[model samples]
Structure formats: structure tokens, C-alpha cells
Target: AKQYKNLVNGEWKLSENEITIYAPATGEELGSVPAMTQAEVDAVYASAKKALSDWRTLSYVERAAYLHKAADILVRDAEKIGAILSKEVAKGHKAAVSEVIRTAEIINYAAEEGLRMEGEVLEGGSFEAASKKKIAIVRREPVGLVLAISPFNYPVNLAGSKIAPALIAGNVVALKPPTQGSISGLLLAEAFAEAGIPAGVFNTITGRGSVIGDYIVEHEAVNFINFTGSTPIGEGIGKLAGMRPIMLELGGKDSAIVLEDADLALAAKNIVAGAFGYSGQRSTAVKRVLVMDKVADQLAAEIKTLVEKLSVGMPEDDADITPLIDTSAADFVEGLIKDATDKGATALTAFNREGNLISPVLFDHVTTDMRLAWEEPFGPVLPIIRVTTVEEAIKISNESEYGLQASIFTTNFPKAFGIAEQLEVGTVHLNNKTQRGTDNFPFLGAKKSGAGVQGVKYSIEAMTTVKSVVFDIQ
Candidate 1:
């Protein structure tokens, strides 16, 4: 059993208040984590303060080399880390492994983007031509000390998304992974430590957000904060981050729209994967599936077949899903399923639940006002609403307070493209799932879902502030 501690500056500082962690799959005690005090929080910044001035002075190429070295280390230890992640969070092995791969994937891209941190040269612009004999050039500078707060759902990728970009952009980082995750943040920081990425430049300080989140973000030393969590939590952090640049990749009630022209089989397959693959727990998860009535019956029937085949078992086992983080989360799924059925929606498959081992639910005739429609239903609960036209589907997508992502499944290229254009989401997909992001492309969210673009390249951009320098011609 690994009893973890805080990694402040370059030192491993142990503490009291051992938080007992359990395997969500079986309620087995996995390990425990120690929470650092407010003094330790001060020490965290004391370290970052010393490191930022010097780390930012290094050339971008040098920093890229350091990040690339850390990426190499992550690749070698992916399996071991994935195992810890699976046990701690009760994520299925497949998803755990993918999240591990993304740790290195994010770091590798951060390395590449560090080298490509191209600034701008304003040559012969109106301002330059009108008055001055000087040429203006814009270059990005680091945002000083950064507070990167990641969630339990994707401890590895999202943490890497914050850590890699901040470090690559020459910002010192103090990362705080959710207590539910149990590992990952310290593991990743240790990997960088092994690679000799200076002490204060990278730090991991873990505790519940209630205890340490505001303390860290509200501190005057924090230059920026990048957070990923539910809307309430993320928005709270945004408010606390007052005046400091804050970047958020918050919650989503994402949708998958299936038009009559779409390949029904392909549409069913992708929507099933999107809705339930990560146990319906991702920020970009497809909570609702809107289908044109012309083919709603055919698609829902196909989805029923797909849902039955998923193997729900232990996290480390070769199963399609493990369990929810705990019983409360499981109860939310149960409540939503029951509420939907009570309000005139039919379940295509039964929502069988023995504690957290929930059967993936597929709801038909899910109304817009139903809790299942607008609410972010976690834990393999998928609500499918029938639509008369593409416009109705678009209307449904816009009605939600959260606008993270929406996917379009259709064969009509022009029409799909048009809908994609009109969609209010940060990103739209044609013939793909709403989990529509790669390592490099900008992944963003509109409305309350998130603030700022936050893919590898985009994150690096956000972490740095642009400064303009003028030089007069001789």
C-alpha cells in the first residue's frame, strides 16, 4: 500500500491526516494520502518564487529538451503508473492505459511546441508606417508561478495538460491532483525530478479543494490557474482567481446528433463509445443522443445491442467498466435513471445496479425538461432524445447551460458542415464522437463549460503573456 505525501519544491514532505483511499471496484483500501498544512502551502510558493526567475531565463530549446526527457521517462513507466491509476480511481484498464499514454503524449507535444514558440513581428503595419521609425516585435513571456488544479476523472492527461504547458512555457507550477486520484501528480513530478528538471520549477501538493484550493489560487504569488472540474467548482475557482489569468476546461453535457442520413451502424457504434466508454464520466462525455425520428428506432436498437456486450468488472480486470468513484456517484446515476423513467421515458435496457456496477442505460423519448436531458448524468447513463430535424437537434444543443462539445453523424457532407458551423460548442465533429480532440489540436469549450483554448499548443499560448519590443532603424 502506497501512503503518499506532498512533493514541495524538490523535497518529499510527509504530513498527518492520512486520507484512506479505496478501490471503487470492491471498496478495498488501496492506500492513503497526507494533506499538507497552510505553512507547507507557503513553502510551496517559497520554492516556486526562487525557481521562476531562473527557469524563465533558459532558452525555449533547453526547456524543450528537459520536457522531452520527462516524456521519455513517462513512456518507460506507463504500465506501472497505469496500474496505480486503475486501482486508485476504479477506471477500467483500457481507459487507464490510454490516460497513461496521454501523459507522455502531452509532454512530447509540449516539447515540440516549446521549440515552435514563434513570436510575431509587426512589419509595415499602419502604426509602424504612420509615425515611428521603429519596428515592433511581439514575444511571449512566461506567466510566472502557475497554480494547476486537475480533477479525479483524468488525473494523468489533464494534469499533464496543465503541467507540461506551464513548464514548457517557463512558468513554475504547483500541481494539486484530487484526493480521489491517489497517485499520478506525485508520480509525474517524481519522473521530472529523476530527469533533473529543477526543484522549484515543478511541484505537487495534494489535498481536497475545500482545504487548499482557494488558499493556493488566492495567494498573491499565483500568476495563473488552470483548472478542470464540474461547473460549480470551476466557476468558483474562476471567481477566486480574480484578476489573475485563469484557464478552465470545466464540465459538459455534450451531445451526439444522429441524422437520418448518417450511417446508422457507425453512428450507433461511436455514440455508444462516447456515452459510456469512460463510464460516462468525462467532461466531454455524450450525455444525450439526439436522433432524427426517421432512423431513431434503428439507431437505438443498434445501441441496445452494443450496451449488452460491455463487460462490467473490476478496474484492473479486462472489463468494459469498473464502478463509480463511490456509492454517492452511483446513486446519482440511479436517481437520474429512475427520474427519467418516472417522467415518461422508456429505457431500452434496464438500469441494473448492485452498488456501483451499473448497467449502461439507454433512454428513449428523453424530453428537454427531463433531468436526464439537461443534467450531466455520470456513470454509464445515456439519454437519447428523438428529433424531427437537424434544427431541433441544434436547438437542443444550444439550450444547455454547458456548451463543451457536440458531434454530428451524417453522410450529407454539406449539411453536416453547415450544422457544425451553427453549433454553439467550442468544437464540432462531423462523422465523429464529441470526444473530438487529439494531443495537438485546440480543445476548448463555449459558455459555462470552459474558458480559453487548451490543447497542447493552445495551453502553452495561454500560459505565456505576449510582450512587444520596439527597435529603431539605424
Candidate 2:
């Protein structure tokens, strides 16, 4: 059992209280973290604020070097941190390792992309209304201290996604990692500290959200907020954050639309991968499948065959289906499954539950009246909603409150493009699974899914503000 400390002022220290973390798979004591208070959090903000002046004074090249060094540290410690993430968050070991490595790549991308970011220079006469002798130089500046709040699902990767971009763009960060996964988060923060991010430039505040959640978000010193979590909590933060620049990657009810022309085998494989990967805990997970009735039965059969093959086990086993984060999450998933079954939906897979370990439950003929049709299970449960036509599929998919990402599987390019153009989502997958593809492309939300964009360049831009200097040439 390891005891972790809060990262502040480039030093790790204990707090007045501790929050013991137990593995969701085995109920074993994995580790413990400091349950920080408001005063301690305030001190962290002060340190970040003080460091911001000297930190931002450095050239973008200098700041990028720190991010590179941190990425190196992350790569060097991927296996060790991956184990912590797997045990603490109940994710598969392979995925845990992959997430750590992916985060390093994201950091490197942010560093390289930050180097290429340049300001714009405009001449006044170009607009036709201004004097020809005037020149304006518009540059991006750091947005002071950025408060990054990450979720439990992809602790290291998501947390690093925010931290790397913010730091590369010359802003200091205070990471409020999810309590359930704070141990892994603190380890990642330790890597940044070891890479020499300067005192207080990177800090972690770990505690129960009920104690210090609101206080930290509403803090006067926080210049920007970058958060990834559930929609309700994200909304609450938006309400408390007032006018500060905020980026929220919230909940999603992403749907996979299988047209009549879609190959059942291909559609089933991608759907299983998208919907059940990481136990359907991803914000971009295909929560529901809107399939045309002409081929719904075939797709359902194909998907059921793939779903049954998924192995349910613990994180150490690296099974296809691991235990969820906690028993309450398991209970919630069970409730959704029950609601679907009660409303004329048939469970293709057995609804097996042993504590937090839930076998994959695939549903067929799920109707809109079922709560599972719109609710995010965040577990191993996939529902197939049969539709009569392409228009009906689009209507059902668009009815979802979440506009994060959607997938359409079909052979016809023109038809697929037409449907893609009609669906209201951030990214549309053509014959592929819905996912946050890479760190280079633009990733955002249309409705309650998110507030701002989150790719490499977009994240760098979000953490910064533009300042224009106008000069009149004589």
C-alpha cells in the first residue's frame, strides 16, 4: 500500500486528512492520497500565480522544452504508472499502458505544435477603411493560471491532454485529478516535477470534491478552467466559473448508425470495439446503435456473436471486460439494463453482476421509451434501436442531447456523406467507430457534450488570449 502526497511548490507533502483508495476489482487497498483543504489549495494557486510571471517570460521554444522533458519522463515511467492506473481505475493493463504512452505522444505533439504556432500581422489598409501606414501584430499570450479538472476514466491521458497544452502555451497549471484516480494523477504530476517544471508551475490537488470542488472553481486567482467529467458536474462548474474562459469535455450519448447497406460483419466488429472498449466508459463510446430495420436483425446477430466473445475479468487479466470503477457504477448500469429489459428489450447477453464486475449486456429492439436509449451507462452495455429508414435513424440519433461524436456504417459514399452532413455532432465516423482519433484533429461538441475545442492547436489556443499591438508608420 503506497501513501501519496499532494504536489505543491515542486514538493510532495501530506495533508491534514487522507483518502484511502481501494481497487474496484478486488476491494484491496491500492493506495492513499491527501484530502486537501481550501487553504492548501489556495496556497497552490499562489505558487502558480507567482511562477506564472517568470514562466511566461520564456520564449515558446523554452516552454516547449519543458513539455518535451516531461513527455520523456512519462515514457520512461509508462509501465509503472500504467500498473497504478490499471489497479486504481479498473482499466485493462494493456489499455492502461497504452494510455500512458498515448499521453506522452500527446505531450510531444503539443510541444511540436506549439513551436509552429505563430501570430498574425495585418496591415490597416487591407480592410479598405483604415490608413495605409498602420500595422497590427496580433500575438497569443498565456491565460494566467489554468485549473485542470480531470475524470477517472482516462486519468493519465486526459489529465496530460490538458496539462501539456496549457504548459506548452506558457500557462501554469493546477490539476484537480479525480479522487478515484488521484494516485495515478499524482504520479504523472511527479514526472513533470522531475522534469523540472519550476516551483509551483505544476501542482496537484487531491480531495473529495464535496469538500473543495466549488471553492477551487470559483477561486479568484484561476484564469481559465479545463474540465472533463459528467454533464451535470460540468454544468455546475460552468455556473460557478462566472466569466473565466472554460473548456468542458462532458458526457455523451454517442450513437452508431448502421444503414441497410452496411456490412453486418464490419459493423458489428467496429460497434463492439467502440461501445464496449474500456467497458463503454469513454465519453465517445457508442451508447446506442440506430440500425435500419431492413438489416437490423442481421446486424443484431453479428453484434451478439461478438459481444458474447468478450471476456469478463479483473484488470490484471487484461480481459475485454474489466470491473467498473465501483459498485455504485455497477448498480447504475444494472438499473439501466433492467429498465431496458422491462420496456420490451431483450438482452442478448446474460446480465451477470458480481460486485463491480458486470458481463457485457447486449440489448436488441431497444425503444426510445427506455432510459438506456438516452442515458450513458459508462459500463459494458450496448443497445440496438431498430429504425425503418435513414431519415428515422437520423432523427433518432439527433434527438440525443449529446452531440459529441457519431458513427455511420455504409458502403455508399454519397449517402454516408449526406447523412454525416445532417447529423449534429462534433465528429462523424464513416464506416468506422466513434473515437477521439488523434491529438492533431479538432475535437469538440455541439450541444451539452462540451464547451470548446480540444485538439493540439485548439487546446493551445484555448489556454491563451490574443493581444494586438497596433503601430502607425510615419
Candidate 3:
């Protein structure tokens, strides 16, 4: 059994309180994590304050090398990391492995981005000799201290995205990993330390969010905050982190539209995967499906067939569609389904399953007023709405307060593009679902979904700040 401790000021220290981490699939204890206290958080900030200057002074090339070394370590320990992620979060082996691979790839991308950090040179500037001497240069530098708070649903990948780019930009980070999935965070800290990260440059603390989380947000040393979780919490944190830079990757009630001309079979498969993947715990998961009236029945039937084929079992089982992270998550989803049904919506399938294995639930006749449509059902329960025309579908897609992502499936290019333009979302996908992101493009939310953007290049931009240098030429 691995003993988890707080990585404070570059050293692993034990805390007065400790919490046991359990495998969500089987409810078996995996390890124990130290619950960091207020004193410990203060000490971490003090250390980070002392170390920030020298660390930030390092060349981008040097920082990139360190991240590349970390990537190598991740690749070497992929199996161990994957196992920890799978055990703690109840993710299937395949998905867990993919997360590990994605982490490594992200680290590598961060390394490359770190080396390529540059400010563009503009053609004109306000200088007396500027016309004779071409003087136009822009530069980027690290934000002083970054406070990264990652969620449990994607323990490794999400944290990796923030930590790698922040570190590559030479920012000292105080990371608060979710207590529910602290194992991956601990392991990641270890990997960074072994890969030659200086002490006090990257710190990890495990504890309740209400306690240490608030400390990091309100701390004076922290110049920036990166969070990935629900919209409410993100908003609260943003309010608390006043005047400080904040990057939020919040929850989504993402929608998928199926037009009358779309291929029902492909749409059904995509919807099933989008709704059930990661137990629907993803921020970009498709929670709502808007089907055209002409194809609503066929699409729902095809989707039902796919949902029935999903086997809800233990995460270790090959046939199991990933299990819920915890019993509370399952209960929460079940309650949402029940409330929808009580509101006159038809439940196609119920998500009542034994243990953490929650089978997918389908619902029809859902309206905009029901909890299923209004609130973010971050689970395997998918609520579908039938619309008479494309205009109604577009209106319904933009009705939600959460504007993370939305998808439209149509054979006609002009109609699809037109609807995509009108949809109120950060990202819109045509002929597919809302769960698409790559390392190259920026991933962001428009409305309450989140703030700022995250990707290899965009994250590097967020991590760094630009300073304009003006000098007079006599």
C-alpha cells in the first residue's frame, strides 16, 4: 500500500488528519491521504513565495526540458498510474489507460509549447527612431504563483493540463487535488519530483475543498487560480478570487441535435457513447438530445437498443460500462430521473443498479422546465426533447444557462452552419456530439460553463503574462 502525504515546500510531510481512499467499484481501501491543515497551507505559500523568483528566471528552454523529463517518467509509470486512476475513480481499464496516455501527451505538448513561447513583433510602435530602426517585439512571462484545483472525475488528465503548462511557464503552483481521487495527484507529484522539478516549484496538498481550497483562493501569494468542477463552485471561487486571474473548466448540460436527414444509427451510437462515457461524469458529456419530430421515434429506438447493449458491472469487468464514482453520484442521478418522471416526463430506462454500476437511463417528453433539462445531470441519464423544426432545436439549444458545448447533426451544410452560428455555446460540432477537444485548439465555455481557455498553446498563454517595454530613442 502506498502512503500519501502532502508535498509541501518540496518535501512529503504527514498531517494530523488522514483520510482513506477507496476503490469506488468495490469499496476497497486503496490508500490513505493526509488532510492538510491551514498551517500547512500557509507554510506552502511561504515556501512558494521564496522560490518563485529564481524558478521564474529560468529560461523557457530549461523549463521545457524539465517538463519533457516529467513526460518520460509518466510514460515509464503508465501502468501504475493507470491502475491508481482506475481503482480510485471507478473508471474502466481502457479509459484509465487512455487518461494516462493523454497525460503524457499533454506533458509533451506543454514542453514543446514552453520552448516556443514568443511575443510577435509588430511593424509599428511609437518611437522617434522607430521608422529608421525597426523596433517591435512582444514577450511573455510566467504568472507569479498559480493555484490549481482539480476535480475527481478526471484526476490525472485535468491536473496534468494545468500543472504541466503552469510549470513549463516557470510558475510556482499550489495544487489542491480532490480528496476523492488524491492518489493520482500524489503519484503525479512524485513523478515531477523525480523528474527534477525544484522544491517549492510544484506543491500538492490533500484535504477538504472547503478548508484548504478556500485558503489557496484567498491567499495573497497566489496570483492565478485554475479550477475544473461544477459551475456553482467555479462561480463562488471566482468571486472569492477577486482581481486574481482564474481559469475555470466548469460543468455543462451540453446538447446534441439530430435532424430529420441525419443518419439515425450513427447518431444513436454517438449519443450512447456521449451520455455514458465516464459514467457521464464529464463536463462536456451530452446530457440533452434534441431530435427532429420526423426522426425522434427512430432515433430514440436506436438509442435504446444501444443503451440496452451496455452492461453495467464492475470496472474490472471487460463488459462493464464504467461505474459511478461513488454511491452519492448514483443516488443524485437517480433522484434527478425520478423528479423528471414525476414532472410528467417519460422514463425510457431507469438507472437503478446494484453497487456503483449505474445502467444508463433514457427519458423523453422532457421540457425546459424539468430538472433534467434545467440542471446539469452529470450522470448516465440522458433527457431527450423532440422539436418540430430546426428553428426550435436552435432555440432549445440556446435556452440553457450553461453554454459549454452543443452539437448539431444535419446533412445540409448551410442549415448546419447557420444553426451553429446561432447556438450559444463555446464550441459547436456539426454531425457529431459535443465531447470533442484536441491539444491544438482552445477549449473554453461561453456563459456559466467556465472562464478562459485550456489547450497546449492557449494554456501556455494563460500561464504567461505580457509586459510592454517602451523606451525613447534620442
Residue 396 displacement (Å), model 3: 1.2
Kindly report which residue stretches of model 3 are placed more than 4 angstroms away from their true locations once superposed. 123-136, 318-320
lDDT of candidate 2 at residue 22, scale 0 to 100: 90
Question: On residues 1-474, what C-alpha lDDT tens digit does candidate 2 reach at each position?
Answer: 989998899889899899999988888898899989899999999999999989988888888898899999999999999998999999999899999999999999998888777999999899766578888999988999999998999899999999999988889999999999899999899889888889988999988778998999999999999999999999999999898989999988998999888888999999999999988889988889999888988999999999999999989999999998887889999999999989889999999988888999999989999999999899999999999988998998899889999999999989899888999899998888988867799899888998999988999988989999999999
Winner of 1 and 2 under TM-score = 2
Against the unseen true structure, what C-alpha lDDT does each candidate score?
Answer: 0.84, 0.91, 0.83
Residue 348, candidate 3: Cα error in Å is 2.6
lDDT by residue (1-474, candidate 1, tens digit) is 777777777777778766777777877776777777777788899999898888999988888888888888888888888888887788877678778888898898888886688888776546545545667899999989989888888888888888888888889999888888847667777778888888889887876656776897788989999998888888888898889899988889888999888899998888888888768888887778989998999998998899888887777775776688878989988998999999999888877887788878889889977898988866888888999988888998898898988888888888888898888898887787777468687799999998999887888889999999988776
- Cα shift from native, residue 439, model 1 (Å): 1.4
Residue 55, candidate 3: alpha-carbon lDDT = 90
TM-score winner: 2
Q: By TM-score, how accurate is candidate 1?
A: 0.97
TM-score, candidate 3, is: 0.95
